[PDB]
Amino acid sequence: SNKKSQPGLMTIRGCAYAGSKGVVWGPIKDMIHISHGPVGCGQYSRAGRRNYYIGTTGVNAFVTMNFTSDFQEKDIVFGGDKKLAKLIDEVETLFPLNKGISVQSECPIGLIGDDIESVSKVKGAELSKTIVPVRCEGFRGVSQSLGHHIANDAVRDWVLGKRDEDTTFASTPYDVAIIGDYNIGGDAWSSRILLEEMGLRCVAQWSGDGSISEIELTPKVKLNLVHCYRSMNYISRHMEEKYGIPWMEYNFFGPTKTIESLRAIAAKFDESIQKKCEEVIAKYKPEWEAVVAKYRPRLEGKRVMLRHVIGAYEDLGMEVVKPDLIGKEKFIFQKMGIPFREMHSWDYSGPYHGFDGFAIFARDMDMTLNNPCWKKLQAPWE
Amino acid sequence: MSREEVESLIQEVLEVYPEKARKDRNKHLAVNDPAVTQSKKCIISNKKSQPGLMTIRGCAYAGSKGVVWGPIKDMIHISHGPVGCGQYSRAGRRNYYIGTTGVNAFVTMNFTSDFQEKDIVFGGDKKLAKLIDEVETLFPLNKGISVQSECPIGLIGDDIESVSKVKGAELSKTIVPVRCEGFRGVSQSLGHHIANDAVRDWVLGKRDEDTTFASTPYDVAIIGDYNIGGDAWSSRILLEEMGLRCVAQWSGDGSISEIELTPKVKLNLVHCYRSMNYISRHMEEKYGIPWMEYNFFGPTKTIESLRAIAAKFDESIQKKCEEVIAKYKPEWEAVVAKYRPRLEGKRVMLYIGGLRPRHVIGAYEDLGMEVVGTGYEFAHNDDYDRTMKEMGDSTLLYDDVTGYEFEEFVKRIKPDLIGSGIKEKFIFQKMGIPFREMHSWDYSGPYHGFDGFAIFARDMDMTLNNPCWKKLQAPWE
Amino acid sequence: SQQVDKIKASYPLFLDQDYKDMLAKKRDGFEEKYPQDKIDEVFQWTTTKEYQELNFQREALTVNPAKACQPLGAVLCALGFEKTMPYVHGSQGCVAYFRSYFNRHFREPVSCVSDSMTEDAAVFGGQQNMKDGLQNCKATYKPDMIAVSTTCMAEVIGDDLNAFINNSKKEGFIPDEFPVPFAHTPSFVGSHVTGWDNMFEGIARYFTLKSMDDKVVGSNKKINIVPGFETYLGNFRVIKRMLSEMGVGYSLLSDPEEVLDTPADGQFRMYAGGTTQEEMKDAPNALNTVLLQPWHLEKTKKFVEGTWKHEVPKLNIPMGLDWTDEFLMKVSEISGQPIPASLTKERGRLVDMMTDSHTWLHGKRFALWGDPDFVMGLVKFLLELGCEPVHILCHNGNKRWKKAVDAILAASPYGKNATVYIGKDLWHLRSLVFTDKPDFMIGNSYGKFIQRDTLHKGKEFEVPLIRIGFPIFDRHHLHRSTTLGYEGAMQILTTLVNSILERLDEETRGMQATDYNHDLVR
Amino acid sequence: SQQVDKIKASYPLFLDQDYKDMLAKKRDGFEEKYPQDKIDEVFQWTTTKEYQELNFQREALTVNPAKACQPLGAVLCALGFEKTMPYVHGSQGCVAYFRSYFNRHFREPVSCVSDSMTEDAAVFGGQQNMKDGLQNCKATYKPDMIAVSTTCMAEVIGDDLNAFINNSKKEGFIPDEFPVPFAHTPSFVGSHVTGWDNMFEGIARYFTLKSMDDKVVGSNKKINIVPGFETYLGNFRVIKRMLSEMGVGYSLLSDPEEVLDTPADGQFRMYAGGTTQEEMKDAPNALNTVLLQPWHLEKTKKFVEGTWKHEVPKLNIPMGLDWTDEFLMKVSEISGQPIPASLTKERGRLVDMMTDSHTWLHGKRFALWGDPDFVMGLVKFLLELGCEPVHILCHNGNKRWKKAVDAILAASPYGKNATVYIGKDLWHLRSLVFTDKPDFMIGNSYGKFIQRDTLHKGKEFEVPLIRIGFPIFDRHHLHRSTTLGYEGAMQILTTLVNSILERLDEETRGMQATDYNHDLVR
Numbered sequence A: 001s002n003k004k005s006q007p008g009l010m011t012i013r014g015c016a017y018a019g020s021k022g023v024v025w026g027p028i029k030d031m032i033h034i035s036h037g038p039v040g041c042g043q044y045s046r047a048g049r050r051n052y053y054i055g056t057t058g059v060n061a062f063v064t065m066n067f068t069s070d071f072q073e074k075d076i077v078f079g080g081d082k083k084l085a086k087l088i089d090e091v092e093t094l095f096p097l098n099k100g101i102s103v104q105s106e107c108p109i110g111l112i113g114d115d116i117e118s119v120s121k122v123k124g125a126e127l128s129k130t131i132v133p134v135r136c137e138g139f140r141g142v143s144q145s146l147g148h149h150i151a152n153d154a155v156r157d158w159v160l161g162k163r164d165e166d167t168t169f170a171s172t173p174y175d176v177a178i179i180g181d182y183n184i185g186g187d188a189w190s191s192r193i194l195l196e197e198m199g200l201r202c203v204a205q206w207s208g209d210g211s212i213s214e215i216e217l218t219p220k221v222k223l224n225l226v227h228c229y230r231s232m233n234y235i236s237r238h239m240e241e242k243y244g245i246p247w248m249e250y251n252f253f254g255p256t257k258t259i260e261s262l263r264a265i266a267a268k269f270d271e272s273i274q275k276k277c278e279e280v281i282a283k284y285k286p287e288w289e290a291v292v293a294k295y296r297p298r299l300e301g302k303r304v305m306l307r308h309v310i311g312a313y314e315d316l317g318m319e320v321v322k323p324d325l326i327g328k329e330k331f332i333f334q335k336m337g338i339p340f341r342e343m344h345s346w347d348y349s350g351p352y353h354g355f356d357g358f359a360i361f362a363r364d365m366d367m368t369l370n371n372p373c374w375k376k377l378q379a380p381w382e
Numbered sequence B: 001m002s003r004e005e006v007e008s009l010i011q012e013v014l015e016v017y018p019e020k021a022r023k024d025r026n027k028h029l030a031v032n033d034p035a036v037t038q039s040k041k042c043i044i045s046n047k048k049s050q051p052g053l054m055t056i057r058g059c060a061y062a063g064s065k066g067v068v069w070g071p072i073k074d075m076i077h078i079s080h081g082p083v084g085c086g087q088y089s090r091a092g093r094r095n096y097y098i099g100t101t102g103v104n105a106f107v108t109m110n111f112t113s114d115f116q117e118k119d120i121v122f123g124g125d126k127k128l129a130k131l132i133d134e135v136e137t138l139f140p141l142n143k144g145i146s147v148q149s150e151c152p153i154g155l156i157g158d159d160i161e162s163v164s165k166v167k168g169a170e171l172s173k174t175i176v177p178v179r180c181e182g183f184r185g186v187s188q189s190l191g192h193h194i195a196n197d198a199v200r201d202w203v204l205g206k207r208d209e210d211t212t213f214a215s216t217p218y219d220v221a222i223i224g225d226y227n228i229g230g231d232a233w234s235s236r237i238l239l240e241e242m243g244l245r246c247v248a249q250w251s252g253d254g255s256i257s258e259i260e261l262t263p264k265v266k267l268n269l270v271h272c273y274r275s276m277n278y279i280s281r282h283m284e285e286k287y288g289i290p291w292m293e294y295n296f297f298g299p300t301k302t303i304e305s306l307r308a309i310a311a312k313f314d315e316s317i318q319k320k321c322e323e324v325i326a327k328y329k330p331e332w333e334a335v336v337a338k339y340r341p342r343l344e345g346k347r348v349m350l351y352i353g354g355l356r357p358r359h360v361i362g363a364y365e366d367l368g369m370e371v372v373g374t375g376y377e378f379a380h381n382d383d384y385d386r387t388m389k390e391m392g393d394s395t396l397l398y399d400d401v402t403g404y405e406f407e408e409f410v411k412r413i414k415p416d417l418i419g420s421g422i423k424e425k426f427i428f429q430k431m432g433i434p435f436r437e438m439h440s441w442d443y444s445g446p447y448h449g450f451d452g453f454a455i456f457a458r459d460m461d462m463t464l465n466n467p468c469w470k471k472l473q474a475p476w477e
Numbered sequence C, D: 001s002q003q004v005d006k007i008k009a010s011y012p013l014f015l016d017q018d019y020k021d022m023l024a025k026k027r028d029g030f031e032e033k034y035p036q037d038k039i040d041e042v043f044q045w046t047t048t049k050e051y052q053e054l055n056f057q058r059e060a061l062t063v064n065p066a067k068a069c070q071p072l073g074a075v076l077c078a079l080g081f082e083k084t085m086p087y088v089h090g091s092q093g094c095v096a097y098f099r100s101y102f103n104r105h106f107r108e109p110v111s112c113v114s115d116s117m118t119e120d121a122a123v124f125g126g127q128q129n130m131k132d133g134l135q136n137c138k139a140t141y142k143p144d145m146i147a148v149s150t151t152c153m154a155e156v157i158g159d160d161l162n163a164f165i166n167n168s169k170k171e172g173f174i175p176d177e178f179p180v181p182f183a184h185t186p187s188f189v190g191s192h193v194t195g196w197d198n199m200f201e202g203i204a205r206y207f208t209l210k211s212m213d214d215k216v217v218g219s220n221k222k223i224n225i226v227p228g229f230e231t232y233l234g235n236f237r238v239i240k241r242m243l244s245e246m247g248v249g250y251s252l253l254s255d256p257e258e259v260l261d262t263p264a265d266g267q268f269r270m271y272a273g274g275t276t277q278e279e280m281k282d283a284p285n286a287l288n289t290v291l292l293q294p295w296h297l298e299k300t301k302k303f304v305e306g307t308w309k310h311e312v313p314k315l316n317i318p319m320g321l322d323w324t325d326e327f328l329m330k331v332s333e334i335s336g337q338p339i340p341a342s343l344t345k346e347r348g349r350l351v352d353m354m355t356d357s358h359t360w361l362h363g364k365r366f367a368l369w370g371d372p373d374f375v376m377g378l379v380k381f382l383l384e385l386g387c388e389p390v391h392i393l394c395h396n397g398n399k400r401w402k403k404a405v406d407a408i409l410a411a412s413p414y415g416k417n418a419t420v421y422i423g424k425d426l427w428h429l430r431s432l433v434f435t436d437k438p439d440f441m442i443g444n445s446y447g448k449f450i451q452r453d454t455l456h457k458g459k460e461f462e463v464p465l466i467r468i469g470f471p472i473f474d475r476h477h478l479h480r481s482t483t484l485g486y487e488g489a490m491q492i493l494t495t496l497v498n499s500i501l502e503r504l505d506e507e508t509r510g511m512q513a514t515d516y517n518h519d520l521v522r
Ligand SMILES: C[C@H](CCC(=O)NCCC[N+](C)(C)CC(O)CS(=O)(=O)O)[C@H]1CC[C@H]2[C@@H]3[C@H](O)C[C@@H]4C[C@H](O)CC[C@]4(C)[C@H]3C[C@H](O)[C@]12C
Pocket: A096, A097, D034, D035, D038, D041, D042, D045
């Protein structure tokens, strides 16, 4: 596990830049993220992931935008630090409402000896703006895991401690942060509505629909709720060690896991939060019960080849393991005749988390698994 | 082409016709002589079409339902008979109007009795009464109903007049029976006449005893303008900028109340003489309302017509007319300066229904284009009397022209542009000659007034000078 | 007022303030218009279920029909034969309307003549009109054939077409050997598809009835193809291409795709392509005859089975995956030619696009209308896509066709919420889409008005229209599309999925309001 | 909350009142958002001419580029050869992005491998990576050929592709006879089309450089066709069909239409079709080589003219009427085959569509962007249609191509208001369409965002997007369209005119406000 990829074999694994720019930093909406290097890396990742956010794109939000230094031969030969400084000045000129800048390094940045840290410090002092250099060169590591680690280190070193000596924020005993939820199709919103219906206050939610001020406010919360453990465990343990903030993993995939996680989260607070959790569970019971009643008979006994995701499949009467469904590879299984659905990287539908997301998940599973198109692969004359 | 050339061409085209057809069609083709004031000495019109010759004429139903009655927005018009006639004429004419369709306006809707075999065998009067009841139930805001007869109505012995009378008395609603069966007459002209008679008999005299309407000395009605692409609105804005009050405007954007108020106006301004001369003469005879023809096609004709209209009123109206002319002079002068250089010395052949073959010449001359051929589908001899003074010397005049006749005329004349309907548009587009639809304005417009002149010049330039006309021959052929 | 640099057409020239004031004065002073609140109240009432109940109680009034009359289809059928002039015995207004309709749909010249029957012929018949029209047509337009249909006037007065044509041949108006097939096409019976059927049966009977002695079934190794009333040239092209790919000899009778798609090269061609008279003469010698649209080719089916002794297969319209497969298998069985690998690959590619778009297509609710065969093929294809055809309307359908469509719907889980309406017009459909809102409408250009009405209720109540069928007047060159076979299925699927995606993009274009779902990748 | 019968996706579920309140609380409490008035002020500022002047002063910052990197084009070129596996020497994330991009555009599996060069390879090079990757690829996927390109990492550290492949063959990792063409594709030079050119030149050189002694020009009586970077399968199909109609022997080098359109029959086909190695070996024996997209095939042209001794004709992309005519005439002259009547009829039908739609097409203003050859072909066709290409943007264009497009524009009266931009991105085009509003935009899916921005300024300022180009992500099966030849011109014309008519229908759908122009017939 977590070893080097065999050369010459196809694989889904991205690079460190994909794990840093595409996952951790890109969803931050009020910041501008410069893909430092040639044009390709920024072009292919532009609006590739559905990290949903609320904002005015191009004015105060920049998630779906592509900011790049567009490296040429002269930038490779003579470096791009002067180009980086000029680009930062131009970004300040043309996008005055940005609340910060991150510089995500592509591969040639780590090979030509460019010092983006010094440029970041100098320009941040000059413009009184947070400029975060991220050394997420794609060749670093073996997958996006090192990209997540480098991006988390950048968050810790440049953003997280910005309000360490600030006490103006008024805190409540029910302060929680949502860490590692990237709001794929609005997953983080579906989780946050349930959390606030419990009486909890979600002070911070990042990266998905996340702002830099929320990241700075994260060290002020009472509890951290980590959705994606493998991409945010470093920052969670850092916050536990430095600020003494406990963290826990929450699983809002399927009604059973959602109920269990809500009760576990309420167990970390007083009795009022527990009573509110019981109220939320009672309120949402009929809705997911109706969803199960409608869709479970259509999905009972179906085998899925893929815990986090097992709960929702089992809530629909589906067996998890000739698979009837499998949770770049999508089209390969599609052409083999097996219905396929992305259970954690879906590019079209959502959300799937929470009680509202469970209805969409059940509808999508019934739609894909029971579609007549899978019954027509063989010509009647063959 | 000289006069002898045109006459020889006419003979050569008539060569292929049989003796009866050739003898009949000889009397409908002529070479223009502007000095002649009696067109009966050179051309014969308003005669039956020769069978099997691909004519362009419509029927009486088309001239009544599609032209005169259909544009009345607040009335519901029932195509009485089988579904076809109503279906083909639904929203096919661009009589622009303001209203909420299906609630208080019904112009683009198709109301029909949808005659079946049992309705043919046993009549359709009971079905007509039931249909009127259902119309009242489902469209309560209609201000009147017209029943336009299709061909089977007059052949099976149906009595729509009695049904109209009984249902109108029962529902206190104006129900106008129009005997516009398609086989009546020879073209849409009899449809115009029948529709005008229906207007006179059932709608026009409704407010004869009503004096509650307040009249002013500057009260005019717009008769025969059907608001094709907003033409009537562009004329009405010019008329009202002149200090006149346009009390009535029908059929285009017309309501039944405006038709009822028409006998209260001081002047009648007839755009299409062909379709409304009957009602204009009746109104002059009965209410003593003077009527006259106006031509708002092109800045020269528009200015002349505006001055002629203002001459019928006091000096204040004439002063306002001069003010309007001065205000709009720079706009059409700029349009001319932009488009006349691109349109100078281009020859045009036209063939439209009954008014436009002579009315639109002035705007073409305003842009520097000369008209060499003109003709009518259904015009009478008075229309040709007005036409020969407008057309140039030794120009071709054709009445009820056939497809082959007009095709050969175009082939042997070679005009730069042709203005006709949709049934010749693609025929002449495939021959490589630019074509402009002169019925619907090629889904553009308006063409009346100064704004209409700007649109007309832009359309003429865009069609005549389009690159697509230089690409019809393959470079390897 | 106009700016010479930016000239405004009627829209938005009449949105100017002076034009707005002029229209307001005209309305307030003379039109005696109902108050706007009363108009809004009546519109809201027309959108309700009570209004739908009143609307569906109609017995005598038809509002916005979805059908034409028989001689239009007769003219379309006549246009499919080589150097053949459609000749409608009756009044000229009918021919003017037919030509205008087909011009607006195809944007091509349409050749058709009338004998101009008038008030005199209403009391003596149109025998003289028939003689003069036949002679004039043959002398002027030089056709190889004249195919005669009727208007409602000649049908009501009872003109005998056979006797009139025989007399015209007897007095020498036309040569006795000149082909003049005829068909009675009463506009008060059926619809345009019925007229197509009548005209085709008349032509086939004219060319084959009296020469059946020397006919042997399956002696020319061909399969006759009767397309019916078809207004997509791509359908003729796809049928011919699929049959040529299989190596199957065929005779497409009434093929108008050439005369309706003539090139622009500087000359006008009145005639182009078409089925030859030799093709119709040799048609009884075919292995079999396949009716592409069987539900309006019943008289043709009776003639072909009774006279030509052809065992016409029970085939649905080759629309969608399953029915295209059935058509190809039947053609393979009749001709003995195996289905080639190219057609198998085409079917596989259609299935691939179905798999690609099933996520966006599944569960979408459609209200569709058109001709019976086209409507049922569309319903079958929508069921194959996982779509729900909630409102199925066919103004010219019958009870047997409705029973067949109900049987199709009962065989699919996606036809559970589907209702079939026959004899109902587009006012009924407007009521249906107001009371039971579908996601989309599928039909001809007339449905655009329905869309307008829905938008008047609100943006959330708007039902967008997808223009598939006849006639399409407000879009250009859509008559070149294909609805038959795998290619037609792919085109229809692309149109449907891209309409859904366009609607989703329009609904999510609002910045900071709905653009969180304005996804680059769909 | 959710209703089981009517389940809401993210739109419009997050428009619910509780979600709205939660989002408002999140924004007001912790997001520290700028006031909405400030956001409106800044957005209005971004639409002004002052902001455009600031935007066009950019030297270092690129915002929303309209180009990709070379190895993407190299992979697309490699996919066009029979049983060939694209192999990118460098980092794995590049290959992941390439495959994701091509899957999203084509909705098909895309085969590509990487040798996964990592931190260690950044010091000692990727020789071991090359050896292991070649061996593993050949063992696992069994390709007949491995085409090698590079990522930016391998190009920066100066990896010698030739030496690495020779060492891999020498040490038994791959057989010495296995064809392994290579090309250096630095992502900091040019764009994806440059990568396509480099990869094609590498493959042609690999197969032809050392065996030119027995080559005779015109000995196989064929014409070589190099399509360049092409993402429309219809373009390959139309070129092949037009050459087959002409009876012209042709060899289409780098033909990927088969592998990008595999059928769904329950079996995954890794390879399909493509140019065989025999055709590449025999390519110097052709009469001539025609480059479909000469403006990004310069290195290929140099190799073909210098090595194969082929007199490559100076031909524009066969886009639109005149350039399709010139391409057909040049093919006729080279092969000696006359242009058949079918192609003449297709040209005439395109001209007929042009004459049918010129009224709606004349004077329309278009901004457009894409690759150089495609952009100039689109400009040429728009000028042929009477349209005005006001904003012409090409991120990967050069000065000579700009001069050529300027010459094309000066030859037409409709190119007077046109400006060509090279080295500009989609933010520049956003500023241009705000300050100089065109009627429509023509480009890939990214332009949708620009449309959103325009709609934020107002409905009257909205510039609708027409999706012609690469990549198209938010629509389905548009990659199957055609842009070349008369068929491509017809498809583009239909798309443009129907987009205009759809916009007009949307603008005139308001009942009693603008629906006076809601014409049934257009
Ligand atoms: C006013 C606004 C600053 C907002 C701010 O920071 N307020 C202070 C921060 C405190 N608040 C208001 C955000 C919270 C509070 O404190 C509320 S309270 O104190 O409790 O009342 C500044 C910052 C960015 C500026 C625009 C951009 O340059 C682009 C453009 C350049 C041109 O040359 C001139 C026009 C443009 C539009 C500028 C206008 C204006 O000049 C903007 C919006």
